[model samples]
Target: GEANSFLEVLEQVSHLAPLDKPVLIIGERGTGKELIASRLHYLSSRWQGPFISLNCAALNENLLDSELFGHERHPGRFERADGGTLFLDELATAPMMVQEKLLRVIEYGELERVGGPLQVNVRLVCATNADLPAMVNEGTFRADLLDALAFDVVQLPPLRERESDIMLMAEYFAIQMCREIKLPLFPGFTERARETLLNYRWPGNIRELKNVVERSVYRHGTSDYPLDDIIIDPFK
Candidate 1:
């Protein structure tokens, strides 16, 4: 179920892997955007090169500046990922100032660290759950930056929409957790458990699903955990 859904995506990755173009991945939270970016790096000619990633939402603009391009003698993601791929997660969270600098890097193939000179040779892969077009219209994000990052965009579907994948992933995660714990036997999902997983909207996507499956397994031991024990809604 998982492999089939990514067939077209894998094809696209394969085609774009050899090139040095910056890639963009759009998806909801926990939709495996980082995993996709890693695939792009490993499948590409730069497989032997380092794969560096940063989440723009995790830091303020000033810190982000230092993290991406470095300050003075400090080496940043660009320098670390030199000859490799640098993945920027949640690109929309970057401020206007940072966006402008990113534009320069994409357009001119060079960047200057804080209080430093021009540095060159870096490839980018950005991911975000935000509506970039809307952000551009709202004047929060730069259109030119979007244009550059939009060279190859892959939009990942949410797990709730992939009917068959819910159960498949649930089983896979359960087995994986059991194996990690060195359990002598693996428990099967009850009919009710399957129905609950299939019917839920899965607002948190795969991250939430993995947590639920692992919790159910640990809580119930070898016994079957029912739908009631596996709570889907956090507020409920």
Candidate 2:
């Protein structure tokens, strides 16, 4: 619980915040992109500054640009985000043209939205689950833009790739579920139940694992959601 799950990455990258460079985080969904983003925000020299963020693919190109650069007096994004860190999630989904605009902002350090011009000093960190290199090859993503964003590329290990974390996460989820419903603290997972959870391939990643454990707790009653009742496809 003390570890933010990306302790290794944090230790590896903590040395780079002294430079003016962007960070690119690559990982699968539910691998805790937001958690990692927060880690980056708090671990930087600008930790005292405000942290700003938005999803690149969530909004249309126009909206996304406005969000990063900011709106008239609305602080758009960059304005409101002045002197802070900007976390751009779902980065690979943005179009090539949009990527170009982002490049300009990073290279020039000032961005003007469709409605206004605002110069905000911000550190950019992009998080993406998509295969950006492949997207660049297919011409959907801009290669130059990718280069700009990844001044410091950090690939996060997915939960599936980290076996030990699975059992830990299951236990963590179990504890959380019990606490949420005001149930008495259960001792721990039965060995059989723990094995079932650890053995199953979590395609949905940690998010799915969390949901399943929570559901199991809800259905089995938090006082004790035994291993037998948890885990999908129990035949294994």
Candidate 3:
């Protein structure tokens, strides 16, 4: 039962912790890639160092470049994360020009901030939901850059595939939600609610599950049941 569970995934992550190679995390939206990245950083030797993260998809090319390498008056995320771990999220959306600069840092631990050949030490961790190999084929993403970042890759399974962990996670979310909302007591999930959670395909993964659980907790008052309002058909 533990063969392909979250514990097994954590085991693999532990094995990769001692090494300082670039690590890539692959998973669908809401699969908790950031959580995995944080785990890797805390478990590594650089745990005390800053764990900086940037979402490449959120910024345009100019902003992304500036954020990574910095401008004349500002310090970039890379500089801030020096001697630390840098987590790049949605890496496939990174601009071509930014990708080239990132490649330079990966190949040689040197980067110019805005305009000297400044050098810094950093451990890189990247995560994305997109098909990177296909992006390489499309000539959008550089193959060599992917090669450099994917020294060690971790793929997270979808919620439906992790059936054994569903109730476990739901219960945990329930407890967290109760604490956050200041509920009088932690409630248990009804049989129907549990079935609804397990049977549905969690397209949005843990984030969606958290929302559902929290909503159910508030609505059910004392126990999670009558999940009709929580679970929705993605097709609709």
Candidate 4:
């Protein structure tokens, strides 16, 4: 949230959260889609409702559908997540049944997982690596579903593209690692270390940068000298 690019997106998120529209968070892998996905719920009117998340990439149709429909003839995530914000991951990759079923809930704000009625109401926030529109074009994703969920969108900047946030995020992770090791002090980075962090194209984005910075601090410990090195590839 330090960079201008990041701030602008948060601005969008803050404004959109209250509207209770279905929000689609689009970004590359490791760009913190889940973080912002939670934020959408955190800053919403339904903040008191349990913030539920279903990671489509992490499960298959039966399990995810079961998780969605959490019980025997039970209220799937739709009714269970009623009165809350439901965040879903990897929207494009979820089974057609999953997406279509979810879209039904978003459309009418109702569900029938009891083998009956509950009028499930939930504000859904979804994330994807890139294009739902592209998937819609291929006829894999339903068009009506896209229109319903695309009420608004939040796009994240991959760390490589946002040079301004590199070390801003780097130092945060560095100090966090220091705290984890019980050093209780911020170990600053050396000029060379800063050079390495900023110049390297972080393919893994913020998550990759966090791994590198945290490892550098923990490995070097509480030495008086600043962190003089950054390992781009851990195996190296």
Candidate 5:
């Protein structure tokens, strides 16, 4: 059910892909924002160029801006993705300083990553789980950058919401795990296992789902029996 819901989004992106305007993708964590972002790139005119990506929350402010716009010797994503596209994840975590450059500062120099020695900037495909428009009101994210990059927006559905894909994805991941182990046959999930998967509220979303499925398959280690064990939490 939820799987088909995402198909609507795929259709939206496919239509938006050909346009050169920047795109915005908003979704909860692990909802496969990057997956759709790549779809945009492949469908666009710049499909041949590199598809560079950065998670805004992963780096400090100064480092992130530098990472966004590469200097002469240092190849930032902008340089590397010269003809392709850039996918910026955790858009709100992207520093306000970095946001400012999304409008001005076109050239590559010793641009700031911290306090401005000077300022700098990218088809930017941005993804965030945070309240982005709220940031604009709070003076955190620049509205102009929001205006600049968000020529189009694509919203993705979370894992629990997409019920049909749960077991569907589970089976596929099972086969993948089986393949990784060089098994003679794919060990399918038992009825009990499917019950556990379909009902759980996957807070970590698709990523968590993959982790749980993989661990279950790996620990079982052989196709001796159908996969009946479903580890909800590996910690326990």
Candidate 6:
């Protein structure tokens, strides 16, 4: 059940893929925006085309722009992604000026380097974890840029809403960690452990889950993974 099931969000996005409309994936930090972006690309006819991702927050202005449209010699992302998809991760983190440049590329179907000029055909997929509309009102982000990339918008439900998936993911991560560490297949959570995992609210989402698992594994010795040490009760 890793990638199965048609939740409302998945169904909605699946319906929109046929139109080649640009999609803006909005969600919390660990809600898997990038995963949805990848699914969209692979599910569409553009699956064969290259999949280029740029984290808007990772790089400063110069790097972000260059990553998106491409640099002088290569002509930037616009040209570099001629027949492919460009995933603009954390669109909210990008500065206004960068947003403006992104808007121009989307609108004019072309982009020039810092001093060069050329146009590249690209399918833009933007994602954001912050409150973008509020940012737009506050003048931190460009409204035009938001509008340009959001020909279609999809909201990823928080992990809490998909509570059942949490246990599954935990088990999945456990097994994955076991394999990667070359340890034996460890059993899943005990009854008490399961209760704790289900009741506790995961504030950091998937990232938090990964960290917790890593911490538990780190404590695990060579012979067996110590599931007992893993925090099961918030009180004790």
Q: Number of the top candidate by TM-score?
A: 1
Ranking by lDDT: 3, 1, 4, 5, 2, 6
For residues 83-106, could you state the per-residue lDDT of candidate 6 as single tens digits? 777888888888777888878878
Q: Predictions ranked by TM-score, top down?
A: 1, 4, 3, 2, 5, 6
Q: How many backbone overlaps does candidate 3 show? A: 0
Q: For candidate 4, write residues 43-105 as lDDT tens digits.
A: 988989988888888888888887775666655766668889888888887888878877777
lDDT (10s digit) by residue, model 5, range 1-236: 34678889988998999887788899988888998889899999888878888898999977887687765457677666666788888888877778777655333323445433433123568899888789889998888777666777898888888898888888888888889988877768889998999889998888989999999998888887888888978888
Q: After superposition, how far is residue 143 of candidate 5 from its true place, in Å?
A: 2.2
lDDT of 1 by residue, 1-236 (tens): 57456666778877877788998998889889999899889988888999999999999989999899878777878889988999999999999999998898888877764451676676789999999999999999999888877887887888877887888898898888788777766667778788888888887899999988887777666533332356554466
Assess candidate 3 and give its TM-score to the true structure.
0.88
- Put down candidate 3 lDDT per residue, 1-236, tens digits, no spaces: 33266777789899887678899999989988888888888999999999999999999999999999988867899899998889999999998999999999988998874443779788898999899999999999999998888998899888889988788888888888888778766757667777788889989888988888887776666533333444443344
TM-score for each predicted model, relative to the true structure: 0.90, 0.86, 0.88, 0.89, 0.84, 0.82
Model 3 Cα displacement at 194 (Å)? 2.8
Q: How much is 77 displaced in model 6, in angstroms?
A: 2.2
Q: Candidate 4: misplaced stretches above 4 Å?
A: 113-116, 182-187
Model 4 accuracy (lDDT, Cα): 0.83
Question: Which window of 10 residues has the lowest lDDT sum in candidate 4?
Answer: 109-118
